[PDB]
Amino acid sequence: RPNRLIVDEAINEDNSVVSLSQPKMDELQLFRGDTVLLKGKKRREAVCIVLSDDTCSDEKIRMNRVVRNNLRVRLGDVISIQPCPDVKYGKRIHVLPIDDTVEGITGNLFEVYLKPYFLEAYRPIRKGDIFLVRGGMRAVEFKVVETDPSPYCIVAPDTVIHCEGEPIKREDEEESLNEVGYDDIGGCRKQLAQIKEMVELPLRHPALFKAIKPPRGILLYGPPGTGKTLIARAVANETGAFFFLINGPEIMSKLAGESESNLRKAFEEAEKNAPAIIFIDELDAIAPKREKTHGEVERRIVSQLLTLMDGLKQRAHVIVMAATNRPNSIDPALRRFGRFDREVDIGIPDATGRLEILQIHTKNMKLADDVDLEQVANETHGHVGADLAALCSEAALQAIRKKMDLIDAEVMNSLAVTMDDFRWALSQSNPSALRETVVEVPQV
């Protein structure tokens, strides 16, 4: 059926735009800017607006995280899209925030988030939809409790929006957008694509590998703070695979016998929630080079980890990935075929990568017009994603301390980060990877 399309990530950051290839748009007779009624898995309906996208496959339909969650759909699923011309300018629309994202923020959540979000953009709205509004360095959720034309509606400047406070609790079915997604990782687009091609099919369609081998071990290595844990969490969340973090320090802290039992039960629990991803953070802490270890219990724990990784073979649909700084950091016999057979190098973000990371970490922040992330991204040489996040946080703190001399959401949204704050943060940047080898595509 032509209306069936495979979901994909959206470059357009707008919350209510569905990107399509022009061939598919004309095949569907869909005109840019028209409303479309996407159909989800559990009878979820999302009213969005279709925009052509040159870099999009005909079958592929690009959607934002918010739209995906509204439809309870993950990347690679199939959704039904058809035009919905029967859209009316609803007058009474009752919208509420979500408690988990409005804690510690006061002031009416209108004229701060909702009003600028709608204003006059004529964003389509459907009953029960969840949408995210960024402002005041916070991403506030909102649930469309009611719409005047049940259920589809399109906001209008004369539309009356009711926000009676009383934030509603998050229903377990809903997946908070505060969770990590593929859009929360920047710089490592190539490595993220590699991990996608590596792990998407085993996690999304385990039965196929059950019939027709799958990758069981992926070793993400690079300078610390590059978001390896972030990448693993994003992959687990997007693929709907149970995630289990095994911090190396956590295991080493446990007394002898306690640590091995903890590791074994972690592996067993991950197996029982298949498909699942087990993230062995700081693997070098658990299994360092043979020379480094000088303890019977340490060698016992390394052997136990090896035995569990081997035992994954008789198991299935479980992908173990770990974080390190260099393959030689961990002992050999862990990269042997099977256990941790695949490798990935997150590396240092490049100029474009640093710009992408800065944009990701400054989404909620309101930065003045004079702030140009390109110039700073050029300035920040040898900065890791964690360093860029810390720099953005420092700029925000600078702005906050400056404004404090003169929390109300209106005040928070009033303050704007200026290029002077970013320059000061640079002066206090303190890069963490200024000595690592530089690998990128030259801009010269």
Partner: protein, 79 residues
């Protein structure tokens, strides 16, 4: 050498229109007047997302083709 533009009004009268590459604001205004009774001076044009306003070009640059592309929809307003 042609354009295929959907016209959707807040009233609800959806319609289709055929345009040409070289088109001025007055051409779309008269086409709208033909398709719908709305006078050309009572229509406020929004296009794209966020919908940019498309007001008549001022004096000096009202000869070039309107930047409207082929395959998009145009929202019509009634005063």
């Amino acid at each position: 050498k042609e354009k295929k533009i959907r016209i959707t009004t807040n009233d609800g009268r959806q319609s289709m229109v055929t345009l040409k590459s070289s088109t001025t604001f007055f051409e779309l205004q008269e086409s709208i007047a033909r398709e719908f009774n709305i006078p050309p001076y009572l229509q406020c044009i929004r296009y794209g997302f966020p919908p940019k306003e498309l007001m008549p070009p001022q004096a000096g640059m009202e000869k070039e083709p309107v930047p409207l592309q082929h395959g998009d929809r145009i929202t019509i307003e009634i005063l």
